[PDB]
């Protein structure tokens, strides 16, 4: 059989960046030829692999990550990057062998009043490790003063939401980001090209 194209890209519901969802795509055949042809995408990056010769290459297992971020935040989805998105929400290692895909969804993820359902982390004790998902809702103490209760000075709620308006700038417009990481163990016969 063939690997889920629609189940991942053409999925109706995408998660938020701080709560990105994994998708393990194993024991199947995948052709990236259909992906490269579509001109819908806005950024089709790859790291450690060739874009056009993806089709012929074979891996052990693949891990698709689904989430949505701002337009300016797409730049932060890369190895050795820093910022509110990379440090505290989603982080890629330096030895990242994979690809970064993101397309515009302002038409589909922006409301007339505005969409505020997409949220993002803004604070954390220490920076996240690669592929580390932290979804804890616990409030963090910026200042010295202990805050066992809830919001006040230097005691803040970790998250924040995006104002996605169709009249907002392209930098503020939403983008659906998918990140494919690859893996190779001793047994490599599971995923391969046409």
């Amino acid at each position: 059989n063939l690997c889920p194209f629609g189940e991942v890209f053409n999925a109706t519901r995408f998660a938020s960046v701080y709560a990105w969802n994994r998708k393990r795509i194993s024991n199947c055949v995948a052709d990236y030829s259909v992906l490269y042809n579509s001109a819908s995408f806005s950024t089709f990056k790859c790291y450690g692999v060739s874009p056009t010769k993806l089709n012929d290459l074979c891996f052990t297992n693949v891990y698709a990550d689904s989430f949505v971020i701002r337009g300016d935040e797409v730049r932060q989805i890369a190895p050795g990057q820093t910022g509110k998105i990379a440090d505290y929400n989603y982080k890629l290692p330096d030895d990242f062998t994979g690809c970064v895909i993101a397309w515009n969804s302002n038409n589909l993820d922006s409301k007339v009043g505005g969409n505020y359902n997409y949220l993002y982390r803004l604070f954390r004790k220490s920076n996240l490790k690669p592929f580390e998902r932290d979804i804890s809702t616990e409030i963090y103490q910026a200042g010295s003063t202990p805050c066992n209760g809830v919001e006040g000075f230097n005691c803040y709620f970790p998250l924040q939401s995006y104002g996605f308006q169709p009249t907002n700038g392209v930098g503020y417009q939403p983008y659906r980001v998918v990140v494919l990481s690859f893996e190779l163990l001793h047994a490599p016969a599971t995923v391969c090209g046409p």
Partner: nanobody
Amino acid sequence: QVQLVESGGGLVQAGGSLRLSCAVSGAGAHRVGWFRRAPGKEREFVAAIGASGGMTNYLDSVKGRFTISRDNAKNTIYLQMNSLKPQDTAVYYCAARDIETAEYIYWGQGTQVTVSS
């Protein structure tokens, strides 16, 4: 900028209910919470609502007696108050947190709430 206007304060006997509102000057994508002015301590956190309406947060002394919600379409935020207590007598402010700094820079005048027994 961002402006706030409260309404629905007044006098209440022990028990009973109050539903305070808060009008907003076009602000969007802000976390909002309520602050009350008790004579003993004053200016303390009470409740908290996300812009999406999720990620609610309250007190533990008021956990389950107050319930916060909002109507972005109607551009206003409500605070339901049940089972009042002589401790809860206070002036109730409404606050808007800025996207960058979570310090609640935009405020409102606030109203009064009095509980007698």
